Amino acid sequence: MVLEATVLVIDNSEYSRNGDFPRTRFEAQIDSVEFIFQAKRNSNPENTVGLISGAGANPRVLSTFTAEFGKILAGLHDTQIEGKLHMATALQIAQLTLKHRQNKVQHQRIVAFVCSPISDSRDELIRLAKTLKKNNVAVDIINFGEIEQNTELLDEFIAAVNNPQEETSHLLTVTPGPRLLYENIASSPIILEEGSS
Amino acid sequence: EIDTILSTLRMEADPSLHPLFEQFEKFYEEKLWFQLSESLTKFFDDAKSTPLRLRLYDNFVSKFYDKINQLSVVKYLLASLKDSKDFDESLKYLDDLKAQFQELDSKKQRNNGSKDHGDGILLIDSEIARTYLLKNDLVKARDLLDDLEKTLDKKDSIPLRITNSFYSTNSQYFKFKNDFNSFYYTSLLYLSTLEPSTSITLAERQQLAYDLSISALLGDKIYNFGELLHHPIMETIVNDSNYDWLFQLLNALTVGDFDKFDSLIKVQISKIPILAQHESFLRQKICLMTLIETVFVKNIRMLSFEDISKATHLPKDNVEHLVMRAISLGLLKGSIDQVNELVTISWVQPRIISGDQITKMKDRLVEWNDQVEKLGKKMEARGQSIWV
C-alpha cells in the first residue's frame, strides 16, 4: 500500500470478553492487534502505528507512532479489562495524535475495533463527523460488537467522510461466529480494498 | 453439562422461580457474557434466601475461573454465605476457595493481560472473620483484622466494595466489646463508601442506624449531633415509631434542656437495658454539652460557678469536676480558679459553620484590610529617599 500513519484503537469494555470468539474475545484481540500491525507493515514497510485505548473507563495514550511492535505489545499487556467504550473521545484523541508525527507526509487513518454498542450522545457524533472531513482523516471501523443488538449510528458519518481520495473510508461488518477474529478482518478488505478516486 | 444441572435447580424450586434459571442458559447459548453477569446479580439481589443459591454459583465459577473479572465472581459466594444458618459449613467453603485463588493467579495473569488477583482473597478473609463473630470468637477475628488492615495500606487504594466488607467485620466486633466510641468511627465511614448495590438490604441499613444513634448518646467527645441528622441515614427514618424517642434524645442534647431529656430517659432506661448499663456516661453527657454550648455562642471568655450551677442543675461542688473532664476531653482549654471561682476559657472547638457565621468572619476582615492599607500609605511617605 502507501506510506500510512494509523491509530489502532482497542476496546476494553465488558463486552470485550464475550465468548463468541475463542477462547475469550480478549485473547482473540491479542492475536488480532499483533496480526493487523504486521499486515500493514508487510504491505509497504513505511507504515507506522500508534496505540491508544478508547476504554478502561478512561482513555489512555500508550504509544505514539513507532515501527516496532515491541512497544505496541508493551502498551497492550498493561490494560484494565473493564471499561466502556467512549466513541467520541477516541476519535478526537486519535486526530491530535495524527497532527504530530515523525513523518508528516503520510495518510491519516484510524482503525477502531468496536466490541460494544455505543452509549454516546447523538449530538456528539455529528460534531466529529465534520471534524474528520476538515482534517482529511479516513476511518475504517471493524464492527462485530455494535451489530449484536444495536443499529449503526456511525454509518452516515463514515459515508460522509469519503470523498474521491486515494483512501476510502468504509464500515466493515464482521459475522461474529467462530472462525477467529484475525481471520474475519483478513477476509474483510482492509489491505485488499481499492480507492474512491 | 449445564443442561443436567439446570433441570435439578428447577425441580426442587418453585414454579415462580423457573424463569430465573432459564434466563442464564439463554445468555450462555448466544455467548453474551456481559448480560450473563448482570442476570446473576438480579438473582443475588433478592433471592439469596432460596435454598438453591449456593449450587447455582458452583457451575458458573468453574467456567469463569479465569475468563471474566475476579471481583464479579467472588461477589456471588459472599452473598450466598450470608444466608447460611450453619456457619461451620460457611467456614469450609471459604477455606477451599481461598486455596483456589492462590493457585488461580498463575494462570489468570496471562489471560487478562496483567492484572491483580489479591481482590478475591481480601474479601475471603473478611468472610472468615464474620463467620467467627456470628459464632462468638472475638480473638480469631482479632488477628484477622491486623493482617487485613496492613494489606489495605500496602496498596495506594482499596476499592469501595472491598473496603465495605473490611468495615463490615469491624462494626460487628466492636458492639460485642461495648465500646461506643469505636463503633461510631466505623459507621460514619460505612455510609461514605457504601455500596451502590441494592444488594445490601435496607433492613441492615436501618439496624445499623439505630446502633449509630446509641453510640453518640453514650459517646465521649461526639458533638456532631446536628451532623448525624443531615445525612440520609437518619433524616428519613425520623417518623418511624421506635426511632422517635431515640432522635428526641439527639434534639434535647442539642438545645441543652434537661426536662425533655429527663422525661424521655426514665421510660427508655426501663424498657431497653442497653441504656441501663451505660447510665453513668449518659447523665454526665448532657452536663458537658450544656457547658460547651453557652461558652461557644457567646464571645466572652469567663463564667462564674454561679452561672454554671443554674445552667446544668449541679451544685458548685460538682461543677469543678465538670470543668475538669471538659478540658481533659479536648472540648475547651483554660484555667480554673477557686479563689475567684471563674473558669477562664481560651479555646473553643470549631463546630458546624452556619450561613450566618460566614458573614460574621468577613466583617472583621474588612476591618483589618483598611488598617493595613492605611499604615502602608504612611510608611511610603516616611523613608521616601531611602529605599533600594
CB-CB contact of B331 with B288 (8 Å): yes
Is A18 close to B34, i.e. CB distance below 8 A? yes
For residue A7, list its beta bridge partners: A50, A110
Mutation pick from B30, B37, B66, B157 vs chain A, by most beta carbons of A within 10 Å, is B30
Contacts (Cβ under 8 Å, ≥6 apart) of B6 = B21, B25
**CA distances to A33, B132, B258, B268 from A67, in Å:** 14, 58, 81, 78
**Rg, chain B, Cα only:** 29
Collapsing DSSP to helix, strand or coil, A11 comes out as: coil
β pairing state of A4-10 and A107-114: parallel
DSSP state of A120: -
Mutation pick from A17, A26, A80 vs chain B, by most beta carbons of B within 10 Å, is A17
Rounded Cα gap, residues B119 and B74, in angstroms? 9
Q: A77 at the B interface (CB within 8 A)? A: yes
Is B67 close to A17, i.e. CB distance below 8 A? yes
**CA distances to B135, B224, B261, B281, B324 from B328, in Å:** 39, 18, 25, 15, 6
Q: Could you tell me the three cell numbers for B272?
A: 431497653
Q: Which candidate, B231, B222, B160, B215, places its Cα nearest to that of B183?
A: B215
Segment holding A139, helix H or strand E: strand A138-143
**CA distances to B26, B92, B357 from B122, in Å:** 33, 17, 46
Backbone angles phi, psi at B244, to 5 degrees: -90, -70
Q: A30 at the B interface (CB within 8 A)? A: yes
Q: Could you tell me the three cell numbers for B148?
A: 487485613
For residue A138, list its beta bridge partners: A109
Is B33 close to A79, i.e. CB distance below 8 A? no
Is A14 close to B34, i.e. CB distance below 8 A? yes
Rounded Cα gap, residues A83 and A13, in angstroms? 4
CB-CB contact of B195 with B208 (8 Å): no
Is A81 close to B32, i.e. CB distance below 8 A? no
Mutation pick from B63, B67, B107 vs chain A, by most beta carbons of A within 10 Å, is B67
Rounded Cα gap, residues B178 and B174, in angstroms? 6
**CA distances to A14, A136, A195, B44, B297 from B200, in Å:** 24, 52, 58, 10, 42
Q: Which candidate, A192, A2, A8, places its Cα nearest to that of A110?
A: A8
Is A24 close to B111, i.e. CB distance below 8 A? yes
Rounded Cα gap, residues B127 and B90, in angstroms? 9
CB-CB contact of A5 with A136 (8 Å): no
Q: Check the CA dihedral A43-A45-A48-A51 and report its sign.
A: positive
What's this structure's resolution in Å?
4.1
For residue A140, list its beta bridge partners: A111, A170
Q: How many helices (H) and strands (E) does chain A have?
A: 6, 6
**B339: number of Cβ within 10 Å:** 5
**B52: number of Cβ within 10 Å:** 17
From the list B33, B114, B115, the residue facing A17 with the nearest CB is B33
All residues of chain A having their beta carbon less than 8 Å from the beta carbon of residue B112 are 26, 79, 81
Is A20 close to B31, i.e. CB distance below 8 A? yes
What own/partner pairs with CB < 8 Å and gap ≥ 24 does A147-153 have? Answer: A147/A173, A147/A176, A148/A15, A148/A117, A148/A176, A148/B32, A149/A117, A150/A117, A150/A118, A153/A118, A153/A120, A153/A122, A153/A125
Q: Could you tell me the three cell numbers for A134?
A: 476538515
Q: Which candidate, A182, A168, A145, places its Cα nearest to that of A38?
A: A182
**B182: number of Cβ within 10 Å:** 15
Q: A80 at the B interface (CB within 8 A)? A: yes
Rounded Cα gap, residues B68 and A18, in angstroms? 9
Is B33 close to A82, i.e. CB distance below 8 A? no
Rounded Cα gap, residues A85 and B349, in angstroms? 49
Is B114 close to A77, i.e. CB distance below 8 A? yes
All residues of chain A having their beta carbon less than 8 Å from the beta carbon of residue B69 are 14, 17, 81-82
Is A18 close to B114, i.e. CB distance below 8 A? no
- In our burial notation (b when 16+ CB lie closer than 10 A, e otherwise), range B240-256 reads eeebeebbbbbbbbeeb
Mutation pick from B68, B69, B119, B161 vs chain A, by most beta carbons of A within 10 Å, is B68
User: Which single residue is written with the C-alpha cell 461474529?
Assistant: A176
**CA distances to A1, A45, A61, A187 from A4, in Å:** 8, 9, 19, 21
Q: A29 at the B interface (CB within 8 A)? A: no
User: Which single residue is written with the C-alpha cell 471459604?
Assistant: B94
Rounded Cα gap, residues B284 and A72, in angstroms? 68
Rounded Cα gap, residues B137 and B173, in angstroms? 9
Q: How was this structure determined?
A: cryo-EM
Rounded Cα gap, residues A18 and A14, in angstroms? 8
Collapsing DSSP to helix, strand or coil, A52 comes out as: strand
Is B112 close to A30, i.e. CB distance below 8 A? no
Residue B336 identity: I
